[PDB]
Design a protein around this ligand. Structure first.
Ligand SMILES: CSC[C@H]1O[C@@H](n2cnc3c(N)ncnc32)[C@H](O)[C@@H]1O
Ligand SMILES: Cc1cc(N)nc2cccnc12
Ligand SMILES: [Cl-]
Ligand SMILES: [Cl-]
Ligand SMILES: [Cl-]
Lengths: 623, 299
């Protein structure tokens, strides 16, 4: 089901108009709160002293109807960036009046046009409405993919439409929006109602709006092609755009008169497109709810994870068959067939939780036809209760549970294989490098560690939405920009990947090395082909469990149906303009003292940011 | 029963009967109406009218189409043709065709009388065939709302248009590229051709300037304090120019645009003006104050 409204500029009986619209199947109606042509004067007599009423009564609809069904529209004559001072002054008063009337009514949203370049005074007056009274009304900026000037019929003899591609020029309507929302200080209440035209522009023009807070998509009846039977439809290229907007769950407005049949037909088509799409895959079903939801990354070393947190980890049996296989392959490479009875291998699950890897090790040994000795080292003592109850009931003497920190544990004997899953969304963000370094002393000189290797990846992104979400995490009793100097786990959804992920930090286990130092400093250069705004860097990772067996959340090499891990986000404080052809150069440090580990970062090109999270002031990872 | 407060249009037909268009721009119900007055001095009184009718929506502009035809520009997005019946008591709808996508703001009949052009807030201009009841041609020349369209009085294929994109287009549909842009500045708001001189028109802007323009190749006067809404030349051989505004004033002007008459009887926006064909010194105006004022211009 698609949430869909009707846009009208002519309402004689608000009662009948609504009922007609509701019978057609529209969730809501966009309409004028005053008469579109009822121009008003606020300064010059005699016109200023005009006998009221100035508009319709609020009593004509219920409070519930005003709150849910009606979307107000600014009067088309209200032009507060007019060149004429008098029109400017009248429009300011007219705008506030209309917006204040929408507030008085409790309207869910109010529409405003962005149809020229300089909308500076419109932005000013809107900002003032926002800091005057206490109301929850949304504001939908009607702005087109392509300006009417750029799609006009080539029919003025002495003013022909240039037939030269203007790359940045074709994106001008994005800049109309960018300057408006920048002027209004990135208010969460100012969203986009993107208007679509009959001929779509180049892909880079549409792609420009990825990341932007699109709350609606306006479809004029005129853009619909007619088919053999007579219904309205859209071109295959328009549908692609609709399916993309459907992922953003935008509200679809239908503007203009019925050129076609019913009106339900325009609406029925949107339903038909919505019914017939690729269904929500097993990753995306699990992720439904968490789209662009910021979370603190887990620190299972410093904290003790909850029973349900472990339960979540365990709903990914794909991951554990990958762990099963990697262990299975390793057993064969170590224990030759003739030695199978004599030679019992010492496996040590380091950070076992509730023993999914313990079972995967028991099963890998069963499928390999080789004998093993298990140790289940778990730091969390609450999880140890789970193990020790499994261990009494099923496992028996084969599994020895060890309630200790792997770095502290005095082992009775060395290990053939150390298995572990201490990897966060950025791989090393849970301090697996430091953990396994401490456990390294009790690996045999020829011992394997599963995973043998892990690498973190990074990619610059554009989401003015996710920038705003990070911005809203300002908290009492701390640095007022601390929220920008810390990573977030988040299913990135409305965003734009500005360059292919390149690798950041890498660790190998066992770390065969004299002076083991886990601190890092990596410089990356990202080639950017688009005009955009950088707001952060997505983080992913990849790990080699054993040989060709891998786990990955890197989008291009993603391990199949692995919903457990979501990407990580390193935001920046101030968004950076990046032109087509420019290079985003980011710096990342991994740092540590005896007590804590952290990331610092900075963009050095095309302009320098500040160094983010210096000395772990806003974010650290507890050793 | 009641005629709507906001009087938009007023035009005299050949014999001297007065057409009044109007709409409700406030209150419970936003609808329009059309009204014929065979006694002009009786307007606006509803009880003393020859004919009247209710339209479903407002009335942004209208014009006469011969002697019994009333072409209307509504908020609904439709251009409507109403006609009188065989004894001029009823006003019946001939057609009502929803082809523009937004408020139809402006309308004008071409020289032939069998076609007309319309302008809307949808930015489109359309040439209509009034017999076949269809759009022949649709032009999206402008980049903003179509404010005014004015048919060439004598050349059936020519007309003017103006818009919130700052353009004034001189049309000529005999070309493969009909529109042509004309310079002198603030947005054009009203348009009027000179009746005698085929090559001349005048435009009023939103700043209250009226300016004289020759198609080949420029005098101008600051007449009003606010937007020039309408411009109607008189039916004299040497015609005077009546200029309206949103300052609630009226001025009649000469050839060189100097000021002869001034009228501040109007208490709200002056929406139309129309000269009496019988008495050329008598000029009739309407407005949103609901007044039908009749001036005696000192000719
Ligand atoms: C499946 S999450 C990884 C598990 O590793 C455990 N863990 C993390 N660090 C250590 C450590 N240094 N010693 C023992 N267990 C650990 C955590 O308690 C968690 O249950
Ligand atoms: C399964 C799992 C293990 C771990 N050590 N960390 C995680 C962080 C996020 C999701 N899953 C995780
Ligand atoms: Cl709007
Ligand atoms: Cl948070
Ligand atoms: Cl610290």
């Amino acid at each position: 089901r698609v949430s869909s409204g009707r846009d009208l500029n002519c309402v004689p009986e608000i009662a009948d108009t609504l009922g007609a619209v509701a019978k057609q199947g529209f969730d809501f109606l966009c309409m004028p709160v005053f008469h579109p042509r009822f121009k008003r004067e606020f300064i010059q007599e005699p016109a200023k002293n005009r006998p009221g009423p100035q508009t319709r009564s609020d009593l004509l609809l219920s409070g519930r109807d005003w709150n849910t069904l009606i979307v107000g529209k600014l009067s088309p004559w209200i032009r507060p960036d007019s060149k004429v001072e008098k029109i400017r002054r009248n429009s300011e008063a007219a705008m506030l009046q209309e917006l204040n009337f929408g507030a008085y009514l409790g309207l869910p949203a109010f529409l405003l046009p962005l149809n020229q370049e300089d909308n500076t005074n419109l932005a000013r007056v809107l900002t003032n409405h926002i800091h005057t009274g206490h109301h929850s009304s949304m504001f939908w900026m009607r702005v087109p993919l392509v300006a009417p000037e750029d799609l006009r019929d080539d029919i003025i003899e002495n003013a022909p439409t240039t037939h030269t591609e203007e790359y940045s020029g074709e994106e001008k309507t994005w800049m109309w929006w960018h300057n408006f929302r920048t002027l209004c200080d990135y208010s969460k209440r100012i969203a986009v109602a993107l208007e679509i035209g009959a001929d779509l522009p180049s892909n880079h023009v549409i792609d420009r709006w990825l990341g932007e807070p699109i709350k609606a998509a306006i479809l004029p009846t005129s853009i619909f092609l007619t088919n053999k039977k007579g219904f309205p439809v859209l071109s295959k290229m328009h549908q692609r755009l609709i399916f993309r907007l459907l992922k953003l769950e935008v509200q679809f407005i239908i503007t203009g008169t019925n050129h076609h049949k019913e009106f339900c037909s325009y609406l029925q088509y949107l339903e038909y497109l919505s019914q017939n799409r690729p269904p929500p895959n097993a990753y995306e079903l699990f992720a439904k709810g968490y789209e662009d939801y910021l979370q603190s990354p887990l620190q299972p070393l410093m904290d003790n994870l909850e029973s349900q947190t472990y339960e979540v980890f365990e709903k990914d049996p794909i991951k554990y068959s990958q762990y099963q296989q990697a262990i299975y392959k390793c057993l064969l490479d170590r224990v030759p067939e003739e030695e199978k009875d004599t030679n019992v291998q010492v496996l040590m699950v380091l950070g076992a939780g509730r023993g999914p890897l313990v079972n995967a090790s028991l099963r890998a040994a069963k499928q390999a036809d080789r004998r093993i000795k298990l140790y289940a080292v778990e730091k969390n003592p609450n999880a140890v209760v789970t193990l020790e109850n499994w261990q009494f009931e099923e496992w028996g003497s084969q599994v020895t549970v060890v309630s200790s920190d792997m770095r502290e544990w005095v082992a009775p004997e060395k290990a053939d294989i150390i298995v572990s899953e201490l990897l966060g969304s950025f791989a090393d963000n849970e301090l697996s490098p430091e953990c396994l370094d401490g456990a390294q002393h009790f690996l045999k000189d020829d011992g394997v560690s599963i995973p043998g290797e892990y690498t973190s990846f990074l990619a610059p992104i554009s989401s003015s939405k996710l920038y705003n979400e990070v911005r809203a995490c300002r908290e009492k009793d701390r640095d007022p920009e601390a929220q920008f100097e810390m990573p977030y786990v988040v299913r990135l959804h409305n965003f734009h990947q500005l360059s292919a992920p390149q690798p950041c930090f890498t660790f190998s286990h066992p770390n065969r090395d004299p002076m083991i130092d886990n601190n890092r400093y990596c410089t990356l250069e990202f080639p950017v082909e688009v005009n955009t705004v950088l707001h952060g860097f997505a983080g992913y990772f990849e790990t080699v469990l054993y040989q060709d067996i891998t786990l990955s959340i890197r989008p291009e090499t993603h391990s199949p149906g692995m919903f457990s891990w979501f990407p990580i986000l390193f935001p920046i404080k101030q968004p950076i303009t990046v032109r087509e052809g420019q290079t985003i150069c980011v710096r990342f440090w991994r740092c540590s003292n005896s007590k804590k580990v952290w990331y610092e970062w900075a963009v050095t090109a095309p302009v320098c940011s500040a160094i983010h999270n210096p000395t772990g002031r806003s974010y650290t990872i507890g050793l | 029963a009641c005629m709507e407060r906001q009087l938009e249009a007023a035009r005299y037909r050949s014999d001297g009967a007065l057409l009044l268009g109007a709409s409700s721009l406030s209150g419970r119900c936003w609808a329009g109406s059309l009204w014929l007055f065979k006694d002009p001095c009786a307007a606006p009184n509803e009880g003393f009218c020859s004919a009247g009718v209710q339209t479903e929506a407002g009335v942004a502009d209208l014009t006469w189409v011969g002697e019994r035809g009333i072409l209307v520009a509504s908020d609904s997005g439709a251009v409507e043709l109403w006609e009188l019946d065989e004894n001029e008591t009823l006003i019946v709808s001939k057609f009502c065709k929803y082809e523009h996508d937004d408020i139809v703001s402006t309308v004008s009949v071409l020289s032939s009388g069998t076609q007309a052009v319309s302008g809307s807030k949808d930015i489109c201009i359309k040439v209509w065939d009034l017999a076949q009841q269809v759009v022949l041609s649709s032009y999206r020349a402008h980049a903003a709302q179509v404010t005014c369209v004015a048919a060439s009085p004598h050349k059936d294929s020519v007309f003017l248009s103006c818009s919130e994109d700052n353009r004034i287009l001189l049309w000529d549909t005999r070309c493969p590229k009909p529109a042509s842009q004309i310079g002198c500045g603030y947005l054009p708001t009203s348009l009027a051709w000179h009746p005698q001189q085929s090559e001349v028109f005048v435009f009023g802007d939103e700043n209250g300037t009226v300016s004289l323009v020759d198609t080949k190749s420029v005098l101008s006067s600051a007449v009003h304090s606010q937007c020039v809404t309408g411009l109607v030349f008189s039916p004299h051989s040497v015609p005077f120019l009546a200029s309206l505004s949103e300052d609630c004033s009226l001025a009649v002007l000469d050839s060189s645009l100097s000021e002869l008459f001034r009228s501040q009887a109007h208490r709200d926006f002056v929406r139309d003006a129309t000269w009496s064909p019988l008495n050329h010194s008598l000029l009739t105006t309407v407005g949103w104050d609901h007044q039908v004022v009749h001036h005696v211009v000192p000719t």
